[PDB]
């Protein structure tokens, strides 16, 4: 079916934003957003 262009293109483009606001912190520190998107990295792994 055609709609795999429609879905999974937005799957990547959401996932790169998931790596955009990933804010690195030097000596093992997490703010809140890095805590959340680690669990959201499970969502992107779930799809593929």
């Amino acid at each position: 079916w055609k709609p795999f262009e429609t879905i999974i293109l937005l799957t990547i483009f959401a996932n790169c934003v998931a790596l955009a606001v990933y804010l690195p912190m030097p000596e093992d520190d997490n703010n809140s957003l890095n805590l959340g998107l680690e669990k959201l990295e499970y969502f992107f792994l779930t799809v593929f």
């Binding site: 912190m25 030097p26 000596e27 520190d29």
Partner: protein, 96 residues
């Protein structure tokens, strides 16, 4: 900042200095706090009380005191050797 100007412009103080020591403070912001704590303790007279408590994952007293000191000349010298050996890693919480 001179002894005679401070007593005549304040009252005694039960003061308590908390130093955030997570991962977010290694580098430039470490050397400043090591400096700025060491400059804060000189504005004390000898009615003022202090105690230095880093907060981290848990909150502890890196001082060997666990309560308030009298802040002599002497007890201010103890804390500065405590301040100048603080590591920096972990997670901020502000609630513990």
């Amino acid at each position: 900042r001179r002894p005679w100007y401070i007593q005549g412009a304040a009252s005694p103080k039960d003061m308590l200095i908390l130093v955030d020591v997570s991962g977010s403070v290694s580098g430039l912001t470490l050397k400043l706090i090591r400096t700025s704590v060491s400059e804060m303790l000189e504005t004390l007279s000898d009615d003022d009380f202090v105690n230095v408590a880093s907060f981290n994952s848990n909150a502890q007293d890196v001082s060997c005191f666990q309560h308030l000191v009298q802040a002599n000349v002497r007890n201010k010298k103890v804390l500065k050797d405590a301040v100048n050996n603080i590591t920096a890693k972990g997670i901020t919480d502000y609630k513990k």
